Paper text:
Further analysis with cryo-EM confirmed specific RdrA-RdrB co-complex formation and allowed us to determine a 6.7 Å structure of a representative single-petal complex. In agreement with negative-stain EM analysis of multi-petal complexes, the RdrA heptamer footprint sits primarily over a single RdrB protomer and leaves room for a total of 12 docked RdrA complexes on the RdrB core dodecameric shell. Nearly all contacts between RdrA and RdrB are mediated by residues that reside in an RdrA α-helical insertion that forms a crown on top of the AAA+ ATPase domain. Modeling of a complete ∼10 MDa flower-like RdrA-RdrB complex demonstrates that the RdrB adenosine deaminase active site remains solvent-accessible, suggesting that supramolecular assembly could represent that active state of the RADAR defense complex.
The RADAR system comprises two genes, rdrA that encodes a protein with an ATPase domain, and rdrB, encoding a predicted adenosine deaminase domain protein. Here, we determine cryo-EM structures of the RADAR defense complex, revealing RdrA as a heptameric, two-layered AAA+ ATPase and RdrB as a dodecameric, hollow complex with twelve surface-exposed deaminase active sites. RdrA and RdrB join to form a giant assembly up to 10 MDa, with RdrA docked as a funnel over the RdrB active site. Our results define ATP mononucleotide deamination as a determinant of RADAR immunity and reveal supramolecular assembly of a nucleotide-modifying machine as a mechanism of anti-phage defense.
Residue numbers in the entry:
A (entry chain M): 35 to 50, 69 to 76, 81 to 94, 102 to 140, 147 to 183, 190 to 395, 412 to 474
B (entry chain S): 35 to 50, 69 to 76, 81 to 94, 102 to 140, 147 to 183, 190 to 395, 412 to 519, 524 to 661, ...
C (entry chain R): 475 to 519, 524 to 661, 704 to 897, 909 to 934
Amino acid sequence: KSLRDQLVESIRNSIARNVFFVDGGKTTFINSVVKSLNVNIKCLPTIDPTKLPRHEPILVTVTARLNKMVSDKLKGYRKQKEQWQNHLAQLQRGLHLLTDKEYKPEYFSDALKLSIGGQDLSEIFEELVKRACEILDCKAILITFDDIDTQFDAGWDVLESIRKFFNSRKLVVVATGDLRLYSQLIRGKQYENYSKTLLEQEKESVRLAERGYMVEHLEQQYLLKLFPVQKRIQLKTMLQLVGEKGKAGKEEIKVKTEPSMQDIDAIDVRQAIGDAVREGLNLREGSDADMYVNELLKQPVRLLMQVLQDFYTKKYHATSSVPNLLRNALYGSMLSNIYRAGLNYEQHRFGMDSLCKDIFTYVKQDRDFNTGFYLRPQSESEA
Amino acid sequence: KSLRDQLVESIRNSIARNVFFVDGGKTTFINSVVKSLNVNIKCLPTIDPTKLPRHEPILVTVTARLNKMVSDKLKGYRKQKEQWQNHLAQLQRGLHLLTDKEYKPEYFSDALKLSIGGQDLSEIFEELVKRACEILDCKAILITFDDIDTQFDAGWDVLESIRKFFNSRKLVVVATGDLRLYSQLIRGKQYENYSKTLLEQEKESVRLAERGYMVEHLEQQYLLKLFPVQKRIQLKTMLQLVGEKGKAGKEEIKVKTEPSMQDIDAIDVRQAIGDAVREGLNLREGSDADMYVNELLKQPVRLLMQVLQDFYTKKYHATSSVPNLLRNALYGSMLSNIYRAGLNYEQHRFGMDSLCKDIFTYVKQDRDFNTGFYLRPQSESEALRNCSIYLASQVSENCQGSLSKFLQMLLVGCGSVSIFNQFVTELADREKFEQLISEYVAYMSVGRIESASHWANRCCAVVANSPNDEKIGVFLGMVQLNRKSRQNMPEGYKKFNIDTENGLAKAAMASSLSTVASNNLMDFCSVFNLIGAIADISACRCERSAITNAFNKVIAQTTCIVPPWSTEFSDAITKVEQWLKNVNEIEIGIRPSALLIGKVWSRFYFNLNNVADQHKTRLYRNAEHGRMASQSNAAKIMRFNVLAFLHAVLVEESLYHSVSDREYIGEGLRLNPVTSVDEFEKKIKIIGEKLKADNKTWKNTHPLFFLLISCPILHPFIFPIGGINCSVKALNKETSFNKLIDEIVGDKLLSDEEWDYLTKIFQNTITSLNSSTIVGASYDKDTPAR
Amino acid sequence: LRNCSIYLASQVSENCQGSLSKFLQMLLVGCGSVSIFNQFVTELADREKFEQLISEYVAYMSVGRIESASHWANRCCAVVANSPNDEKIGVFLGMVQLNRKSRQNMPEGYKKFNIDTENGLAKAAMASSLSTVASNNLMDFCSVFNLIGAIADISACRCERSAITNAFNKVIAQTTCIVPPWSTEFSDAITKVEQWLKNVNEIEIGIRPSALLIGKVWSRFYFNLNNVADQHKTRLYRNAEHGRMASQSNAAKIMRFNVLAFLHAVLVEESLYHSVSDREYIGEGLRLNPVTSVDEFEKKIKIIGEKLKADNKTWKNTHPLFFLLISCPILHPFIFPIGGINCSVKALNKETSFNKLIDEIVGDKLLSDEEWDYLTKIFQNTITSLNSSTIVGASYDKDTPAR
C-alpha cells in the first residue's frame, strides 16, 4: 500500500527512458496505483498482454484505447476531431509495416508522400501523443502492462513497442514482472540474431564462451537502458510486511478465520499461521515453529492466502484432526512441487508404508542423509 | 567534445572509402556531430536500422529522406523538380530488384529500355545524389547510421548499401557501434556462402581449419574496405576524460548529487564516486578505494551515471545506511550480471545466510580460492568484477553495527574457502570438481549456516581429515588432546579432564573443544570451535536466561560426523553477559569492509599455519610448564593460536577499518608472535601511546579488538598454565602484556597471586591443559640443554 | 600470427620505452614465464589438458594481471622448486633452497643463514632475496630471480624518499606463497637506494628496449643460469666455501655468479641490439658466458670501455640499461661476496681489475680497500653469512681434489 503511494509520488515527480517497473499480487498493486492516479497526466485502462491476441501490435492496442479515451473526452462537448482522424488515418496506413512479412516496393511511394524523413510510425505515434495531450489538457500519458507470467514471449512485443514508439517526452510506462523472465527474453532473442550455420560450425567451448559473454553484455546494456534501476519499484514482501519474530510488524494485516470476525476477532496473520502450523504439526510453541512459519510467509501471497484460507475454511466446516485438514491444504498448495518430486500422487495410497518411502525419496533429493528426516525448511530448492 | 570537434574538421578536410566509424552515448556523439554540421555538405537525418521495418532497404529509407530535403528546398521557390522525379521514377521501377525473391523474365525488357549498360540502381543512385547536390548546393552529403546493438543483424543491409550505392564521390558515411559485433555479423554471413552438403561432408578438423582461415581472411578483407582505419574514431572513455589517480583530469566534468548545486557545488566526478564507494562500503580512503572507483569508471557511461544518479537521489529521499543504499543501486546496475551469475535474486532472501554462500559461489567462478574473500575485481570477467563490488557492498550492509554478524561472516565466508583450497582441493576433472564443491557446501551448510559452533565443529573434522608429517594432533589452530587416557606416557601429562576446570575457564575450553563423530570420535580443541562459540554467543541478546541456554548449547558436547570423503556457571554467565552489554552497545559503530575481513582472515589463517608448523616439534616430556620458548604444550599452543587471532584482529583493524582515517599500527615490518609475544606487546604499546597522544580510546579506535580482548570466554586462554614464557626477558614482556590487557579492558584479568603462581582453585585461567597429553606427540626426548 | 608477432613487439616497445622498471617487468613476466612454462611446466602436458594447465599456470602467476615483480618472483620460486631431481641440491636454475631448520649435524663452521647477523644495505638485500615459500615444509629459497623481481618492483615507484622505505619493507619482508596446485637500521640503505633512483629516473629517459633485445637477453641469461647451475652442483665440497680457487663453490658463489650472468647477458645484448646505438662495442669475439669465473665478462668490460673511450662514448650514453643495472645498490653486495671471489694469483688479478673497472664505470668505490683485501684473504654492503650457509641437499662429504 505505502509502496503504491511512494511509487505514485515517484511517477508524479517525473514529468517536471520513462518506464517504472514493479518487481514481484503485482496486479493488485498496479490496479491500486491506477486508481490512485484516477501534474495532469492521463491514465488508460490496463494492458494485460497475456490476455491479448497473439498477432496485433501493442501499438494498435494503445492506439485503440486512445481512440476510445479521446472519443469520450471529445464526444463530451469539432476541430480537434478531423485532425485526430487525420493522425489516425496516417497511423493506420503506415501501420502495415509491422505485420508485413515482406516489403512490397509499393510502399516506396507511400514513404515519399508530403522530422527525419520517411513515414516513421514512431513519429506518427509521437505526434498522436502530442494531439492527445493537447486535446485532454494533460502533461503526459501513462501506459500500463500486466505481468506475462502466463505468456512471457509476447511481453517482448511490449519491449519492442517501447523501444520504437514510447521514446517520447509525453509518455511514461509502467512494466511489471520478475526480471528473470525479461532477461531470458532479451537473451531469448539475442542468440537468434546469430546465424544458425555459425552456431552449427563453431560449437567449440571457446567460441561458445565469447558468444555468451557478448550476448549477456548486450542484454545487460539493454535491460539497464529499458528499466533504470531507480525507476523500478522494489516492493515489500508479506514477511517484511509483518513482524519477523515479534521484533517487527510494519503495517500489520490481520486476517479473518471464521465467518463472524467483526473486525475485532480477526485472528492476526502471523499468529493465525503459527496456530495452524503448530496444531497441524503437533508442534508446540517452540522456536522451531517460528522459523517454519517465517519460511512459510515468504511464499507467494496467493499461495499463502489459499493455503490458510482452505485450512480455516474446512476447519469451520468440520466444526459446523487439525493436521489432516491441514495437509489437505498442502496437497493443493504444493502438489506441483510434490508431483515434480516424483513421490506419491494418489491420495488413497496414503497409508503408513508410502510415507516411509516418501521421506526416503525427499532425503535422496535434499541429500542430507543426516537430519533430512527433520524435514526442516533447509533446502535451497523451493520445490 | 574535442573528439567530435576534431571529427568535424576531419570530415570538412576530406572533400578537398569515405566511411567513418565511432567505436562505442554513441548516439549522443553522432547526433552532436550531426548538429555540428547542422566544404558545403548536407547532413542527412540519422538512420537507425533498429528503428526501421524488419524488411526495408536503407536505399528506400535514404531515398524518402532525400525526397523530403530536395522537395522542401524546392517547395522553397521549375526545371529541377520534374527531372528529379524522373530520377525518382527510374529508382522506383528499378527498385524491385532489391526486394524480389525471384527473377521474373518480364523485367528483361524493362532493363531493355532507355551510362554503363543495364538497370543498376547503384548508378541510378549516384546520378540521384548528383542532382541532389545540384539542388542543395553542397559539395557532398553525409549519411548517418545508428548503433545496432538492439538488433545488430540490421546493419548488414546498410553494409550492402555501402558497397552498392555509397561507392560515390559526393558521399560521406558515418557509422556507430562496436566493430566486434560487425565482425560477428560478417563471419556468420559468409558461412551462408557455403553449400551445406559440403559442410556436413568435409567436417574433418583440418578442413574446418582451412575453411575458417579463409573465412577470417575474407572478414578482414571486408572490414578494411568498409572501415579504413584512418577514418575510425577512437571515442575516448570517461576514464580517458577523468584523472586516473590525480595526475590527470583533462577537462573535468562535474555532476550533481542533490537538487541545488548552482553550478558551484558540483562535487567532481571522481570525488563523488569515491564518496559513494567508500562510505557505501566502509572502505576508508586507502589505496583500494581508488582502484575500485577506477574499475567503476571503466564501465560504460550509462551504467556508471545511472548508478551514481540513483544512489544520491535516494540518499536525498531517505534523509528528507550508506552501505545498504549503495548495494541497492548496484543491485539493479549489475542484476543481469548477478542474474547470469546465478546469485541470490530474492531481495527477501538476502540476510547474512545467503551472503556467505554468495561469496563462496563468486569464489568458484573467479577461481582464486586464495584471496577471493577479498572480493576485489581481479577477474577478467567483466560480469564477475562488478558482482564482486555488489557482494562487498552487501557484506558491509549485513555487518553494519554487528559484532557477532561480523564474526559469522568472517567465519563462514572467509575461512570456508581457506579450508577448502588448502584442505579440500586434494580431491578434485571439472564436473567432479563442481560435485566435490557441492558436497563440501552441503557438509558446511554454507549460506544455509546453522550456527558458528556448527560451522566450527564441521571445520574441526575437515581439519582432522588430512594432515600428516608426524600425525601430530596440533593443527592450524587446534590441539588434538587424548580422550582415552590410556597411553604409557611420562611426567604429569595426562588427558584433558574438563571437571578439573572451574568457573569461566572450564566452560571456556569445553566450548573451544570439538568432539567429532568420525568413528574414533576424536575430541578436538580448536580456536576455530571457540571462535564459533564466541560468534554464536556474542549477538544473542541482552537477556540473562537465553544467554545461559546458548552457554550450555555451545558448551554442551555436540557431536558431528566427518564429511563423506575422508550452580557453577552463574558467575561466568554474569561476566559474559556484562561483556555482551558492552559489545551490543559499542558495536553499533562497527563498519568492517569486505577487504577488512579478508585481510583479517588471511592474516590469522596464516599465523595459524605458522603456529601449526612451529609448535609440532616443541613437544617434549618437560615442555609442559611452558617456561621457555622451547617448551610446548596444548595450552601454550592454543594460547598462541588465540594470540595470533587477536594480533591479526588489531593489526588489520588499525590498518583497514573504515572508522579509522589514519594508521596507528605504524610503518614497520608487521610480524607475528609465534613462540614469543614480543611483536604483539610492542604493537600494543605503540598503538596505545598513539591513542593517548591523539586523545583517543580503544573504544573509539580498535573497538572490535577491544571487545575481543574483553570476551570473558577468551581470558582464561590468554595466560594458561604451561604457556607463559618464564624467561626473564620473556617475563618482563609478558608482565607488560598483562598490564596492557588490564588497562585496555579496564579491569585486572588475573590477580597478582595468580600471575606469580603462573610465573613461578584458579578460575579465570586454564589449569589442566598444560598437563593434558596431545595424541601423537611422542614425548620421548626432552628439551635440549644449553 | 605473422602480424600478431609484430603487433606484440610494437606494444612491448611502446610500453617499455624510457622505463627501466617496465623493461624489467616485461622482460621477466612475458618472456621468462613462457620459458619456465616450457622447461619446467611442460613436464605435465591431449590439448584440453594442456589448455587447463596453461590456464592454471596463468592464474598462478597472474600473468596479464601481475600485481608486482616481487609477487611473480615469489610464485615462480615455488614453481621452480616443484620438480628438481638428481641429488636434490637446493640450488635451482637461478636460486638456492636455504636450510631454515638448523638441526643438521654438518661439518666445519657451516650453519643456517641468519638475517640477524647481517646489517643495513646487505641484510635488507639478502632478506628480500629470501624466498619464503608456503609450500608445506616452508622452505625459504633465495633466487637472483627473486632479487631482480625486487629491483623491478623498487626501480620505478617514484622519487619519494618515504615510499622508498615502504616498498623496501614490502619487498624485503618475508613473502609467503603456497605451491601451485600441481606440484633506523635501514636509514642509510634507503638513502643510497633513493640516490640510485635519483640517477636512474633521469638517465633512463633514452632507453629504447626492443622485443628482440628483450627476448635475446632472456635467451642468453637463462641458459647462462642453466650452465651456472650445472657446473656448480658438484663443487659444494666441505672446503668449497671461501671460494679461493676455481674449484671451490658455495651458495654465495652461486648468487654472485647468477647475478653476474644476468649482468653479462645485459651488457652483451645492450652492445648487440639496443636501438640507442648504431654499432656494437662488444666486438667480433667469441662471446661466452662467465660461469665459474669472471674472466670472459671482464674481458668484455675492458674491451667495451676502451672502445667507448676511443669513440668518445660514455657508459651513460651507451649501455645505459647495463650502466644503471650495475649501478644498482642491491646488486652491489653480490658482486664481491665472502667466499665467492676466486683468489688465485691469475684469478686474483682479473678479479681486482674487474673490481676497478666496475668502480670506474659506477663512478664510486663500492668496497673499501680493507674490504677488498679481506675478501682476497662489520663489513657492510657485503654478504658474509652465505659463505657458511649450508645448502639443502649438498652432502658436504668430500673436499677439493689435490694437485
